[PDB]
């Protein structure tokens, strides 16, 4: 444990931004950190047995993960969002899984 870069701090001043579920599924604790009067950055604090990873709440994979994790009846500790959307406008089976198009600014 080093104090040059304080690991012993409840907040997440840094994030990994984008993350995969194989890590997320290992998460036991989730907290939504908000820029308001808590800490100066909006982050998802994720506690894993080996490390505490901090990710961006804007991450699509996280929102997918949280729905799977929300299904836990034991308790919901590693879960923050219980819903990815209010619903989902999805397709049956002919889809991309996530048709995330980087909206091109100025089509001309």
Swiss-Prot record:
Function of the protein: Chemotactic activity for resting CD4, CD8 T-cells and eosinophils. Binds to CCR3 and CCR10 and induces calcium mobilization in a dose-dependent manner.
Chain intervals with Basic residues compositional bias: 73-96
GO cellular component: extracellular exosome; extracellular region; extracellular space
GO biological process per UniProt: antimicrobial humoral immune response mediated by antimicrobial peptide; cell chemotaxis; cellular response to lipopolysaccharide; chemotaxis; inflammatory response; negative regulation of leukocyte tethering or rolling; neutrophil chemotaxis; positive regulation of cell-matrix adhesion
Keywords noted in UniProt: Chemotaxis, Cytokine, Disulfide bond, Glycoprotein, Secreted, Signal
Region (Disordered): 73-108
A molecular-function term among this protein's GO annotations: CXCR chemokine receptor binding
InterPro entries per the UniProt record, alphabetical: Chemokine_b/g/d, Chemokine_CC_CS, Chemokine_IL8-like_dom, Interleukin_8-like_sf
Record-given protein name: C-C motif chemokine 28
Primary residence: secreted
Xref: Pfam families: IL8 (PF00048)
Compartments where found: Secreted
Comp. bias intervals (Basic and acidic residues): 97-108
Sequence similarity: Belongs to the intercrine beta (chemokine CC) family.
């Amino acid at each position: 444990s080093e104090a040059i870069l304080p690991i012993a701090s409840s907040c997440c001043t840094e994030v990994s931004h984008h993350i995969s579920r194989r890590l997320l599924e290992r998460v036991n604790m989730c907290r939504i950190q908000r820029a308001d009067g808590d800490c100066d950055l909006a982050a998802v604090i994720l506690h894993v047995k080996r490390r505490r990873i901090c990710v961006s709440p804007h991450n699509h994979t996280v929102k997918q993960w949280m729905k799977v994790q929300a299904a836990k009846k034991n308790g919901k500790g590693n879960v923050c969002h219980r819903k990815k959307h209010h619903g989902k406008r999805n397709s049956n089976r002919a889809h991309q899984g996530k048709h995330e198009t980087y909206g091109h600014k100025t089509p001309y």
